[PDB]
Design goal:
The PDB classes it as transferase/dna. With about 350 residues, chain A is of the alpha+beta class. Chain A has helices at about 1-10, 15-35, 50-55, 105-120, 180-185, 205-215, 235-250, 260-270, 285-300, 320-335, and strands spanning about 45-50, 65-70, 75-80, 85-90, 125-130, 140-145, 150-160, 190-195, 200-205. The structure holds guanosine-5'-triphosphate (GTP) (2 copies), adenosine-5'-triphosphate (2 copies), magnesium ion (2 copies) and zinc ion (2 copies). Chain A binds 4 DNA strands through α2 and α5.
DNA sequence: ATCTGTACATGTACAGAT
DNA sequence: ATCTGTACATGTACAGAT
DNA sequence: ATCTGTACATGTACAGAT
DNA sequence: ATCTGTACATGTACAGAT
C-alpha cells in the first residue's frame, strides 16, 4: 500500500534515537538535579510525555516533552470563568510566588531563570534556551547534535485529590478500555501547567493519562502484543499528524492548529470505534479516511471537545476563526481527493 | 436448567451481610492482637482470598479465607526435592523459630496467639477447630448466624523475583497478555506453612488468582456495566457444586478439593481465551467442555499447577489411580443422566 | 555504629534492525 | 523469524550523613 | 503507625418492560 | 420467560488527618 510506504518514511531510525536520547537525557538529568538543592522546586520529579514516549513521534527524534512535576498538598482550585480547563490555585517554600494565590507566571519565571543559569554551565554540548513565547507553559531547549532537537521542559503542579468537576463526564472509555481502567486512571493525580489565556491562571494536563491510553489502546489486552494482533490505531495517528505537520510547514494560515487537535480527534474516534477489528492493518486506508472524515466534520461544525473536559471546545470561535477552519477543510479535502500529493513533499 | 441451579447456588444479600459483619469483627480483633501486643508477627497485613472474595462462593457465605502476610527481607529459598512448590527458607523478631525457618514452629506460635485471643471473645460464638496435621490453616468455627468457617493463613511475603519453577507458569500471554503477566510477576510471592518436612513451606498465588478471577476477560470490559457478560464464573460455580455434592456423598473423593477445579478452569480459560467462547447463551456447551477437560485430566492422571508447571496435582503420589477412576465414573454418570445430583438438597 | 537518598540491578514491552 | 536499544517499573546496596 | 472519607467495582432483590 | 433499571450491600484502593 501507498500508506505503508509513507509510514516507512515516518519511521524513526534506531541510530538517530540513540544519539538524540543520549544528549537529551544528559541535559534533562542535569537540570533535574539542579532543581534539587535553597531551591523552591526541590522535590520535583521527572515525567516523560508526548509523542516520543508514546511511540508516535514521526520523521525524526527532534522534539521531546518532559514534565518537572511538583507535589503541592492542601490546595484549593477556583475555575476561571467556566472555561473548564483554566483555574486559579490557592492555599516558611513557594513563598516568593504568592499574590494574595499562586501565580503561574511568577513561578514559571523563577523556574525558567534557574533553567537558563544551569544551561549556561553546559560546555559538554551545544544547547540554548529559546526565547519565551508569551502565554506558553514551556521552557524550550534547542540542542545541536547531528540535528536540531527541541526539548519542552514543562513545569507541573501535582494534586493527588479527585479530579476537578469539569472532568466528571470526560474520559468516556467505558465501552472501550472500560470502567475498572477509568476508575484507576481517575485515582492517578492530576496536573496543572502555567498556561495563561490571567497571569495567575493554570491549565489542566492529562499527559500522563494520554500516555497510558496510547500504550494501552485496545479493547483486547493483547492489542499489539507479541501474542496478540497488531492494530493500525497508532499508524492512523501518525498519518494524520504528518498531514498536519506538512500542511503547517507550508501554510501560515494554519498557525492556530496543532498536533493536540489531531490527538484529541483520534481519541474520540477510538471511543466511537472501540473494537480492535475496526482498526485492522489491512483496513489502514479506510481507517485513515474515516479519521479524516471525522476531522472535517469537527472543522465544518466548529466543534472538537477536549477528551477530558467535555465543555471545552478546542475549535470554538474564540480560539480559531471560521476562515482558518474553512482553509484547513479545503486543504484536507484536496489532499484526500488527489492521492495525498503532500506525502511526497520534501 | 443450569440457570435454575445457579439461582439455587446464588448467595443471599441478607446472609452475606450477617456473615461478613461477624467475620470482620473476629478477624480485625485477631489482626490488632498480632500488632498491638508486639508479638513476633507485628507487621502482618490482612489479605482476603478465596471464593467469597472472588465472587465464586456458592450456596452460602460459610467459608472465608484470609492471609495474615508478613514481609520478610533477606529470604533465601532452597527447593525441597525438586517438588516445584515446596521450599525451605533461610534468614530480629523471628529468632525463636530457627540453624532455617521452621514452618511448624512459626505456625504453632501464630496458632497459640490466635487461640488465646479467641478465648477473650464473649460477644461471638467462636472456637478454634482441632489442628489438622500438615495444614497451614488456623480455622475458626463461628455459630451465631449458622455455621461459618474462617481459615486464617499465615504467609511469608517475599518481594524478590518469583522462584524459577514458576518461570514457565502463568501462561496468560494469549489471554490476559504480556503486560498483565509482567505486572503480576512484579507483585510479591507468598509462602504458607504447609508441610510435605516440618520446616517446609508451600508457594501461594492466592493474590494472583484473585486478580485473574476479577480480571478474567480478553476484553477489558468483560462483565463490566458497559461490556458483555461471560459465563466463565458460572462454569466455575457449576463445577465446584458437582464436586461438593459428590464429595458429600462419597468418601472415595476425600483426596479431591475445589483447588483442583479452580486449576482446571484456569487451564480451560487459557485454552479458550476469547470472551465469545464463554457466551452465556452457551452455558451448557461451556460447562460440558469443562467436564470433558476435567475427565481428560483424570484419564491422563495429569493436572499441572497453573503457576508451577512441573507440579502435577493428579500425580500417583498425591491421588491414587482408583480415586481418579472412581471420580471419572461418577462425573461421566451425572453428565449422561441430566445431572441428578444437582436436584439433591 | 546505624540510617538513607541516590544510583544501580534486574527484567521485559515495544519497536526497529537484521 | 530472531536480535537488540531504549524506556520504564521494582528491588536493593551503599557512601555519606547522623 | 492507624483510622476515616470518598468513590466505584462487584454482587443481589425485585418490579416493570419486552 | 428473560432483560433492564433502581436500590441496597459489601469490598477495596488510596489520600489526607491524626
Ligand atoms: N507534557 C506536556 N506538555 C505540555 C502541556 N501543555 C503544553 N505543553 C508543551 O508546551 C507547548 C506549548 O503549549 P501550547 O498549549 O501550544 O501553548 P501556547 O504555545 O501558548 O499556545 P498554542 O501554541 O497557540 O496552543 C506544547 O506544544 C507542549 O510541548 C501539557 O499539559 N503537558
Ligand atoms: N489463601 C490461601 N489459603 C490457603 C492456601 N493453602 C491452603 N489454604 C487454606 O488452607 C486449607 C487447607 O489447605 P490444604 O492444602 O487443603 O491443606 P491440607 O488439609 O494439609 O491438605 P489436603 O489433604 O490437600 O486437603 C485450604 O482449604 C485453605 O482454606 C493458600 O496458598 N492460600
Ligand atoms: N492545548 C493543549 N491542551 C492540553 N494538553 C496539551 C495541549 N498541547 C499539548 N498538550 C500536551 O502536551 C503534550 C506534548 O505536546 P506536543 O505539542 O509536543 O505534542 P506531542 O503529542 O508530543 O506531538 P508532537 O510533538 O509529535 O507534535 C501532548 O501530547 C499533550 O499531552
Ligand atoms: N492445594 C493448594 N495449593 C495452592 N493453593 C491452594 C491450595 N488449596 C487452596 N489454595 C488456595 O487457597 C484458597 C482458599 O482455599 P479453599 O479451599 O477455601 O478454596 P476456595 O478457592 O476459597 O473455594 P471454596 O472455599 O468455595 O471451596 C484458594 O482459592 C487458593 O488460592
Ligand atoms: Mg512532542
Ligand atoms: Mg474458600
Ligand atoms: Zn493495537
Ligand atoms: Zn466475564
Amino acid at each position: 500500500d501507498k500508506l505503508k510506504k509513507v509510514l516507512d518514511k515516518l519511521r524513526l531510525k534506531r541510530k538517530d534515537i540513540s544519539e538524540a536520547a543520549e544528549t537529551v537525557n544528559k541535559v534533562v538529568e542535569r537540570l533535574l538535579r539542579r532543581m534539587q538543592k535553597e531551591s523552591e522546586f526541590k522535590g520535583v520529579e521527572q515525567l516523560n510525555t508526548g509523542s516520543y514516549y508514546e511511540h508516535v513521534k514521526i520523521s525524526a527524534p527532534n522534539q521531546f516533552n518532559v514534565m518537572f512535576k511538583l507535589e503541592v498538598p492542601r490546595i484549593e482550585l477556583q475555575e476561571y470563568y467556566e472555561t473548564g480547563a483554566f483555574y486559579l490555585v490557592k492555599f516558611g517554600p513557594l513563598s516568593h510566588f504568592l499574590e494574595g494565590v499562586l501565580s503561574a507566571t511568577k513561578m514559571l519565571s523563577k523556574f525558567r531563570k534557574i533553567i537558563k543559569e544551569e544551561v549556561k554551565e553546559i560546555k559538554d554540548i551545544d544547547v540554548s534556551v529559546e526565547k519565551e513565547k508569551p502565554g506558553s507553559p514551556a521552557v524550550t531547549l534547542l540542542i545541536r547534535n547531528p540535528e536540531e532537537i527541541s526539548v519542552d521542559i514543562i513545569l507541573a503542579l501535582e494534586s493527588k485529590g479527585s479530579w476537578p468537576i469539569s472532568t466528571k463526564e470526560g474520559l468516556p472509555i467505558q465501552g472501550w478500555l472500560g470502567t475498572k481502567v477509568r476508575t484507576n486512571l481517575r485515582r492517578e493525580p492530576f496536573y496543572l501547567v502555567p498556561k495563561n489565556a490571567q497571569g495567575e491562571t493554570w491549565r489542566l494536563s492529562f499527559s500522563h493519562t494520554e500516555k497510558y491510553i496510547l500504550n494501552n489502546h485496545g479493547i483486547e489486552k493483547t492489542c499489539c502484543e507479541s501474542s496478540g494482533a497488531k492494530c493500525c490505531r497508532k499508524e492512523c495517528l501518525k498519518l494524520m499528524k504528518y498531514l498536519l505537520e506538512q500542511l503547517k510547514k507550508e501554510f501560515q494560515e494554519l498557525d492556530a492548529f496543532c498536533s493536540y487537535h489531531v490527538k484529541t480527534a483520534i481519541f474520540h474516534m477510538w471511543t466511537q470505534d472501540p473494537q480492535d477489528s475496526q482498526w485492522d492493518p489491512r483496513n489502514l486506508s479506510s481507517c485513515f479516511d474515516k479519521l479524516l472524515a471525522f476531522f472535517l466534520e469537527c472543522l465544518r461544525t466548529e466543534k472538537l471537545d477536549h477528551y477530558f473536559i467535555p465543555k471545552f471546545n478546542l475549535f470554538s470561535q474564540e480560539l480559531i476563526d471560521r476562515k482558518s477552519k474553512e482553509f484547513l477543510s479545503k486543504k484536507i479535502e484536496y489532499e484526500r481527493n488527489n492521492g495525498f500529493p503532500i506525502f511526497d513533499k520534501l
